[PDB]
Design a binder for this molecule. Structure first.
Ligand SMILES: O=S([O-])[O-]
Ligand SMILES: O=S([O-])[O-]
Ligand SMILES: O=S([O-])[O-]
Lengths: 461, 461, 461
């Protein structure tokens, strides 16, 4: 009796799970919104802005109308390598976003110390890929909250808390090729493994060297650390980068997981759209919404507020097929990256509509309990869209100078709706609906062009 | 000198052969129609109505517009496992159809006894997959006729005879998890292998246990039985589930095999249509044609009649791009499952046309020599369409309550053209073209709604 | 720590490299045009006209509208096998074209003798595939020039010189199953390896037998010959048919290589078009341009002329989306195979436009320095288009009686623009714009139909 080999199982549920972390795939939590949960872990934030800064290079005429295709190929080639390192070291890639990848090693409290060693080694081996288009790494550790929000058809998640705030602060201190540890990470780590130095005006530290004790053996140590890693591929599945590659059809699980993935990605997954259709340089309008809270580390306070904001945003976006591309925590606040124009969702008057939707969002969110400040940046132009990452772990992402610009406008012009010159000029709304703003030098931004506040239709706000 | 490994050979002829049994793939018979041939074998009929009854579940709004995709994924996951068992035990899957899969082990007469043992073991291991959405299994053995019918562009086949009648009768007696043997199967089997019980008012038996003799070794026995299995993958190809996976380009063979496969499937096979385009919940009209004969086990009588009917049906269907999805033998008669509306073949007025085509078919077939009764059921609504089965052995199939309803209408209202309320109401043909029928309780049917006879345009028929 | 296996790397750059020889893939030469380089090597020309003559068979109604699909499947099945032999013997397939495949083993001068032995063995093993739709093989050796020409967006290459002239002359002497050596090949070869015979009225020879010395071991000999083969897959990559399968993303390399590949192929490569869309029987107009030179073995003379001609041709073709499918050296001259109508590039009035473009090309090229004669053949009808060859090495190709006819018209009616009857009749240009020509018997052509000169719009040329 023959024994044929199992076939490569490429079911829709597997393909959906490539777009999600294990935190969600194996999360099994209530469908109630908001949902909050609490754990401990180590975070790694890998600043890949040096790669995504290539969007400019690839809009050159030199690329003969295949800039987007070339961009996605070269980005994925480098980002894949980072993803593989994270996964082989036992990490969960949470999100690709804010010109960064964020990864998590969730463990019980007692194991944070040893897991920090693992993550430092991983970090150093990531830097190792690119010796000779480099990255900066921040590490944090400690208490982490998770929030899941959404409605009956769509779900989003966020991780929150001081360790999350810390990991971005750490990464912002890093220079290229650095690994920076948060103060708490440094307090919790195995100091015998590493040589550090002080970072001026900061309690964060820089790892100069991982130099373990004489009798240390990393592979044996790692094996010990895998006892605490629930989903590390093992046994018959030790050849797989993710256990999620083994997922079998389960309609109730797939119904829950598809809520995290945009409809046009699901169309591709279902082989009802060409696999290359979403890689494009396309004109869009970015509406970047920032919500600041009194206290942004307290999920129990900020979770209902985000949920209420989300319900309104989604209703407003529905009317114009705008989409939410990403939600993430910034140093200050919860940010929604909304896009008007992307998977063939491109209505005419996208600009006047974008500004009107921004104002609606601004007015509603400003009256939500516990939301202290709302800030919205609106920028329009060519952006790269595509599925970025590894075959086994990837996400649809939008990258470009106008993305960056809308993000910086919402941070440098807080409490108002701002727009760029493309949007202002294109809108053909009357000019007294705007205010011309002072020029600010914004980290990452070369020549803003004139920026404007969208004051709105009436003098008396 | 290097020796690179043969590549995965995924030629069009291989892809076409996935849709056909070995009976046809390796049949090499004349292109003359009808064609009849005669052999012996063991049949297994696996009632998968418990899986296909899930079409209802998947039309819920809960499935957010991906019901068809979810349905095909979960069906294929379970049906694949059944198919693999059949193939590894040396069976030929003949058809997926009538909420069942039918499989054949063709052998010389002297080996029927030992092959029945093989098939009983297979049957028990199929039940084993689903312990903890179960199936019922009928087995028959004996003389089997095959009929191939069609024209210059299209071919269809049927297996016929008492063993075929028996295998459906056996399966209809089974409860869930049962294996029922036909009277002849029980007469021909190795009684020392099994413990049976009587089935009330029947000469069929139920297998309680396969309990072989003390010195029996199934793997050694199976190896002996493979001497008689012409196409069992072996040697260099012992890792393949089907020898047909090894087929090489051969234009004369491909011309013959493509005649069995619908044009829209061939479009997919030729990579000229997306691989997911045929998985859909779509509105159609089912026209289910049953032809009863004096004697339905005699291919030499019924073969010309079916051929003549087929020639007329196809001409009538051509005019409205209706398609024949399946042809199969029922307890009573040869049934044609015709569909109006499926691979983007959807003409307007599908309902008046469907009724007019049914009447045409009814009038012509009623005058065909040896056709004793014609019965036609017409039902319209949402049905699941898709390629169902294993990668290596699968078929386009239509599944749904309206399929079931049209099938039961043709059996419970013999000798007439009947239609459901959707069809009657939608047609906007005058009401005196119909007769409102008595309500019958039909096994498998919950609330028919009012049913109608299509009497036709004139009072005097 | 797990070690997952590298995935099958199917990047766009790899897929582009399948369409090109190693000569270009690893060429790294200046982007300046024309570019010329000089080397030595052995050439093999494999006449596959016996396969491509099947286009006629596959336009039969017997193939039910899948002639093109069946043709490409059967062609690729046989041509793949030839390609694998060439590659495993260390050859570089340069082009698929002129009903032939051309391959090159580039080596330093001192190794030509031993490499000829390798190529003769390869040739004999190619014939071996088809014992029991056969091929003819010519071999040449010696000095070879390469020319690369084009503009900022498109590139083409040619190999030139007496060895190239020789390899076609050798192949034209061959009968089926023959291997014919050019005079220089025979002068340079290891005469102890082979038994030859004279070819009447020729200094070329026919290989009767490869009968090496008593102590000869081909595998050991081949291993020695691989020292001189720069890109022979080896070591960790000894399982690959081409090193080019290992190419990694590199935007500057991909920008250079995509210039050799038509835009519609790049669309497929980018998964923005179905993989089967370019296999078709379609009506087109072939415009076959031949340019003859005083001295066609001297790249330094003919290279600027070809470049100047190319610049004009491309400008003329642009206006009507005509494409250049192939450029190659014929016994006499440089030929451009231009096509009007192929990857959905089909403008109305294709015929009057084709004739007007031919005349433009004829008038311009006739005034180019060093171009001695221009001849253009114009023929219109159904042709097979598709990607032909092996997965790892293949090219878009057009095949058909009208291709053949336009090629023979340009050779048998030199110095003029000629067209077939389909073109003349269809154009609805006045009849005095043409001259009806004497009938010539053209090798390969059965019934021309009447042929015409396109004299043009005025009496006085
Ligand atoms: O989920 S992280 O963007 O706050
Ligand atoms: O071929 S079986 O449906 O009678
Ligand atoms: O490149 S060969 O056609 O002269």
């Amino acid at each position: 009796m023959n024994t044929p080999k199992e076939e490569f199982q490429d079911w829709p549920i597997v393909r959906i799970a490539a777009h999600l972390p294990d935190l969600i795939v194996y999360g099994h939590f209530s469908p109630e919104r908001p949902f909050m949960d609490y754990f401990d872990g180590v975070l790694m934030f890998v600043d890949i802005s040096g790669f995504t800064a290539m969007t400019e290079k690839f809009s050159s005429a030199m690329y003969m109308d295949r800039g987007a295709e070339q961009l996605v190929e070269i980005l994925n080639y480098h980002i894949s390598a980072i993803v593989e390192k994270v996964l082989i070291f036992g990490g969960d890639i949470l999100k690709f976003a804010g010109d960064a990848l964020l990864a998590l090693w969730r463990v019980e409290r007692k194991q944070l110390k040893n897991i920090i060693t693992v993550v430092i080694k991983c970090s150093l081996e990531i830097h190792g890929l690119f010796e000779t288009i480099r990255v900066k790494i921040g590490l944090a550790a400690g208490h982490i909250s998770m929030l899941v929000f959404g409605d009956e058809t769509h779900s989003h998640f966020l991780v929150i808390g001081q360790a999350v705030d810390d990991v971005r602060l750490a990464q912002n201190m890093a220079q290229m090729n650095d690994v920076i540890l948060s103060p708490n990470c440094w307090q919790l780590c195995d100091r015998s493994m590493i040589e550090i130095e002080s970072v001026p005006d900061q309690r964060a530290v820089k790892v100069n060297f991982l130099k373990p004790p004489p009798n240390f053996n990393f592979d044996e140590f790692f094996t010990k650390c895998t006892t605490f890693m629930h989903y590390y591929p093992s046994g018959e599945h030790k050849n797989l980068l993710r256990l999620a590659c083994t997922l079998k059809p389960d309609p109730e699980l797939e119904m829950s997981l598809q809520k995290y993935v945009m409809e046009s990605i699901l169309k591709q997954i279902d082989n009802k759209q060409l696999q290359g259709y979403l890689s494009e340089l396309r004109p869009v309008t970015i509406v970047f919404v920032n919500l600041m809270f009194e206290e942004q580390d307290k999920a129990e306070e900020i979770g209902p507020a985000i949920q209420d904001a989300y319900m309104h945003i989604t209703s407003v976006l529905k009317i114009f097929q705008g989409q939410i591309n990403k939600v993430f925590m910034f140093d200050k606040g919860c940010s929604f990256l909304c896009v008007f124009g992307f998977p063939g969702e491109k209505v005419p008057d996208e600009l006047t509509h974008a500004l009107e939707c921004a104002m609606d969002i601004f007015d509603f969110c400003s009256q939500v309990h516990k939301i202290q400040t709302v800030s919205i940046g609106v920028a329009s132009g060519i952006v790269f869209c595509g599925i970025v990452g590894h075959t086994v772990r990837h996400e649809y992402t939008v990258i470009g100078q106008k993305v960056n610009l809308a993000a910086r406008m919402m941070m440098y012009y807080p409490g108002i709706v701002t727009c760029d010159s493309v949007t202002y000029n294109g809108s053909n709304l009357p000019a007294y609906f705007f205010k011309e703003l002072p020029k600010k030098v914004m980290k990452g931004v070369a020549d803003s062009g004139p920026l404007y506040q969208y004051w709105g239709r009436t003098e008396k706000v």
